[PDB]
Amino acid sequence: GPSQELTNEKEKALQAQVQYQQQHEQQKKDLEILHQQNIHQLQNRMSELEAANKDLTERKYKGDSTIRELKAKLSGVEEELQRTKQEVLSLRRENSTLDVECH
Amino acid sequence: PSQELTNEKEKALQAQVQYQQQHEQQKKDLEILHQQNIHQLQNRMSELEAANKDLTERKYKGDSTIRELKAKLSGVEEELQRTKQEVLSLRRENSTLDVECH
């Protein structure tokens, strides 16, 4: 068959186009898989570092409110100390005047 | 008839050349995209590392400030207790002198 040999070549060319498309799709899939393996460890270390940062930022806010409570507590005690020291001065002054009137 | 056959074999050789150029071009394009993505991930990683360094430094500063405040507060509470006992002693002296006087 002279034309049967020609029809065989046209059949072959259609089959070769199908094979090309399959090989082009397979190369894409293989490259995406290699890519995922390349970024896997880095994506995991990134998510871990974001969560550690979220926890630290949360801890920092708690630390600020603790500092605020401590400063206000300290200011109250420093003022109380001031009014007790002045009470001592007042009492020393009173004691001296009373002591001169007996002695 | 034979020239038409030689034309089909010439065409098939050309289709193979094209498929090969296309296979290479898809790989190069994917590599550019993947390299771009890797650079973005690496950049985000370096900014999370810098944010973590900054947070760890703030955590040290906050915690050390808390530690200093608690120790300062204990010192003042202790000094207050001493002064309060001095007031009690002076009020006792004031009461004994006041009874001898008025």
Author numbering:
A (entry chain A): -1 to 101
B (entry chain B): 0 to 101
Reproduce passages from the article:
Centrioles have proximal-distal polarity and a 9-fold radial symmetry imparted by a likewise symmetrical central scaffold, the cartwheel. The spindle assembly abnormal protein 6 (SAS-6) self-assembles into 9-fold radially symmetric ring-shaped oligomers that stack via an unknown mechanism to form the cartwheel. SAS-6 proteins comprise a globular “head” domain at their N-terminus followed by a long coiled coil that mediates stable protein homo-dimerization (Keller et al., 2014), and a disordered C-terminal extension. The characteristic shape of the SAS-6 ring led to the proposal that the protein head domains comprise the central “hub” of the centriolar cartwheel, with SAS-6 coiled coils forming the cartwheel “spokes” (Cottee et al., 2015; Kitagawa et al., 2011; van Breugel et al., 2011; van Breugel et al., 2014; Yoshiba et al., 2019).
Recombinantly produced fragments of the corresponding coiled-coil domains were folded, as judged by thermal denaturation experiments monitored by circular dichroism (CD) spectroscopy, and formed dimers in solution size exclusion chromatography–multiangle light scattering (SEC-MALS) assays. We succeeded in crystalizing a fragment of the coiled-coil domain from each species, with different boundaries, but spanning approximately the middle one-third of this protein region (henceforth, CrSAS-6_CCMiddle, DrSAS-6_CCMiddle, and HsSAS-6_CCMiddle; see Figure S2A for the protein sequence alignment, Table 1 for a list of recombinant protein constructs, and Figure S1A for SDS-PAGE analysis of these constructs). As the HsSAS-6_CCMiddle and DrSAS-6_CCMiddle fragments did not originally include methionine residues, one or two amino acids, respectively, were mutated to methionine to allow SeMet incorporation. All three SAS-6 structures revealed two-stranded parallel coiled-coil domains as analyzed by SOCKET, in agreement with the predicted nature of this protein section. The HsSAS-6_CCMiddle coiled coil is distorted compared with a canonical CC structure at a region N-terminal to the site of SeMet incorporation (indicated). Only parallel associations between coiled-coil domains are compatible with the stacking of SAS-6 rings into a continuous cartwheel, whereas antiparallel coiled-coil interactions would lead to horizontal displacement of SAS-6 rings, a distribution incompatible with a stacked rings configuration. Both the HsSAS-6_CCMiddle and DrSAS-6_CCMiddle crystal structures revealed primarily antiparallel associations between their coiled coils, with only much smaller parallel associations between coiled-coil copies, which were offset by approximately one-half length or the full length of the crystallographic c-axis, respectively.
